[PDB]
Design an enzyme around this catalytic site. Structure first.
Site, short mmCIF file in Angstrom:
data_model
loop_
_atom_site.label_atom_id
_atom_site.label_comp_id
_atom_site.label_asym_id
_atom_site.label_seq_id
_atom_site.Cartn_x
_atom_site.Cartn_y
_atom_site.Cartn_z
CD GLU A 181 1.65 -1.10 -10.65
OE1 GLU A 181 2.68 -1.41 -11.29
OE2 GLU A 181 1.63 -0.19 -9.81
CG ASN A 241 5.81 -8.12 -22.12
OD1 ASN A 241 5.66 -9.22 -22.66
ND2 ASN A 241 7.00 -7.63 -21.81
CG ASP A 279 2.32 -4.39 -18.68
OD1 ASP A 279 2.56 -4.68 -19.87
OD2 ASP A 279 3.20 -4.37 -17.79
CD1 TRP A 280 4.06 -3.47 -22.59
CD2 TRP A 280 3.36 -1.73 -23.88
NE1 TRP A 280 5.15 -2.69 -22.86
CE2 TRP A 280 4.80 -1.63 -23.63
CE3 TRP A 280 2.74 -0.76 -24.66
CZ2 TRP A 280 5.57 -0.60 -24.16
CZ3 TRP A 280 3.52 0.28 -25.18
CH2 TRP A 280 4.89 0.36 -24.93
CG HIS A 338 3.65 -4.50 -13.07
ND1 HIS A 338 3.21 -3.25 -13.31
CD2 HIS A 338 3.66 -5.15 -14.30
CE1 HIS A 338 2.96 -3.10 -14.62
NE2 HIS A 338 3.25 -4.26 -15.23
CL LIG Z 1 7.34 -4.29 -21.03
#
Ligand SMILES: [Cl-]
Ligand SMILES: [Ca+2]
Ligand SMILES: [Cl-]
EC number: 3.8.1.5
Length: 294
Positions: free
Chosen positions: A131, A37, A107-108, A271
């Protein structure tokens, strides 16, 4: 190098009655890049070139993201982790990946990729991550300056912030990249999300699904499962650490640093480190893959 141009040509495939978009370039065993995301395959555009000729280079747009179809009808119960996983599992099945996949996750994409990897351990040749959600989280792991905003997403205020004002795309994203993005770069990231309302739902459903302090219970369990597994798996790993970094610091970095058979490098970034150090990331992944595929 840097640059706003995407990698390759977008391909489309029908999955569970929706069109999903993906990049798939070259031949051989896959090097599979998964965004999270509020990004898309575009995140990997300056990293994937570094793996040219090392295998089949694949980057999928998650459902409702990038050039993939929106779910219809969308609402607050749509785009949960389980739903994203059903579409991604099905797309990955359809792509005929074979049994020596190298995963590259963020991330996701790390929650999805770590989960898929646990469920398909025999087919995974290596895992490169950065990350990433390495384990279930507590509010204390959560970067201090992000706490109030993410708590807000996970409240009734989330719809106005995200669906109405596009805060994840427009604030969180550039906020967590160290170098300034170009107009063309932001255009690419905002494109799936130009319309106010349900078009932006994936970018709000995601923060509501982060396994934090026991909630949501289903994602917590999935993350608990893969954390235990990864801490014991001999599958080779590449941990791309970041300075200052953002999510994968403190306790959760202490944790992923216990994982076996792991190489680590540090690059500059917060990030979305792909936008800060693409060449160093790409070179590291390429080296990792070369060693896995001598
Ligand atoms: Cl998120
Ligand atoms: Ca910035
Ligand atoms: Cl083979």
């Amino acid at each position: 190098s840097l640059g706003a141009k995407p990698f390759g040509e977008k391909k489309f495939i029908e999955i569970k009655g929706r069109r999903m978009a993906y990049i798939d370039e070259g031949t051989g065993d896959p090097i599979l890049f998964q965004h999270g995301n509020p990004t898309s395959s575009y995140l990997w555009r300056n990293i994937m070139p570094h793996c040219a000729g090392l295998g089949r280079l694949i980057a999928c747009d998650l459902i409702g993201m990038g050039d993939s179809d929106k779910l219809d009808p969308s609402g607050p119960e749509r785009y949960a982790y389980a739903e994203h996983r059903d579409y991604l599992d099905a797309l990955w099945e359809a792509l005929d990946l074979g049994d020596r996949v190298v995963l590259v996750v963020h991330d996701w994409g790390s929650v999805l990729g770590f989960d898929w990897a646990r469920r398909h351990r025999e087919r995974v040749q290596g895992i490169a991550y950065m990350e990433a959600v390495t384990m279930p989280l507590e509010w204390a792991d959560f970067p201090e300056q992000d706490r109030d905003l993410f708590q807000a997403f996970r409240s009734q205020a989330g719809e106005e912030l995200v669906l109405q004002d596009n805060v994840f795309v427009e604030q969180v994203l550039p906020g967590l990249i160290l170098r300034p993005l170009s107009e063309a770069e932001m255009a690419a990231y905002r494109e799936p999300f130009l319309a106010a309302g349900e078009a932006r739902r994936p970018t709000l459903s995601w923060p509501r699904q982060i396994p934090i302090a026991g909630t949501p219970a289903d994602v917590v369990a999935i993350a608990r499962d893969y954390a235990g597994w990864l801490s014991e798996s001999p599958i080779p790993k590449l941990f791309i650490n970041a300075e200052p970094g953002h999510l994968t610091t403190g306790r959760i970095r202490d944790f992923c640093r216990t994982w076996p058979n792991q190489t680590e490098i540090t690059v500059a970034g917060a990030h979305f480190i792909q936008e800060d150090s693409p060449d160093e990331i790409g070179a590291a992944i390429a080296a990792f893959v070369r060693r896995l595929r001598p």
